[PDB]
Amino acid sequence: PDISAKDLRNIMYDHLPGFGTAFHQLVQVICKLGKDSNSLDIIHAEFQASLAEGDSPQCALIQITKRVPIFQDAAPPVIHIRSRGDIPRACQKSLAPVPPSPAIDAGWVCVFQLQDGKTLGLKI
């Protein structure tokens, strides 16, 4: 790819406010699935265009989830953690009960699964 997953992640991070936000996590999800589906260059191009159009970087990421085929009805990744405390502070107000068939394109970034089995969905 013209761009690596790490470099794309860093370009997206360059534009995002704060640290450990729902959108940082979304960047990670996007770069993972994009690397796996060989979509890194299309993702990069779409991100660039969205920024040029005047979109917020957050909106650009969302639009990526809506336009890039790998994200269509794609299940959010499950992230195993010890306790809710392992969830970044800036994500703590973005947690919600997990529905039966969550989809990334619908704003379900990931699902945090606690050791005790309880789940929390990261929602935008």
What residues contact residue 88 under an 8 Å CB cut-off, 6+ apart?
Answer: 19, 20, 21, 24, 25
- 94 lies in the binding site for Na ion (CB under 5 A): no
Nearest distance from residue 73's CB to Na ion, in Å?
25
Toward Na ion, which CB reaches closer, 21 or 94? 21
Q: Which of residues 14-73 bind Na ion (CB under 5 A)?
A: 16-18, 21, 23
Q: Which of the ranges 8-16, 34-42, 77-85, 113-121 carries the binding residues for Na ion, by CB under 5 A?
A: 8-16
Q: Which stretch binds Na ion (CB under 5 A): 10-18, 33-41, 48-56, 110-118?
A: 10-18
Q: Cβ distance 84 to 48 under 8 Å?
A: no
Nearest distance in Å: CB 87, Na ion: 15
C-beta of 72: minimal distance to Na ion in Å?
A: 24
Residues in touch with Na ion (CB under 5 A): 16-18, 21, 23
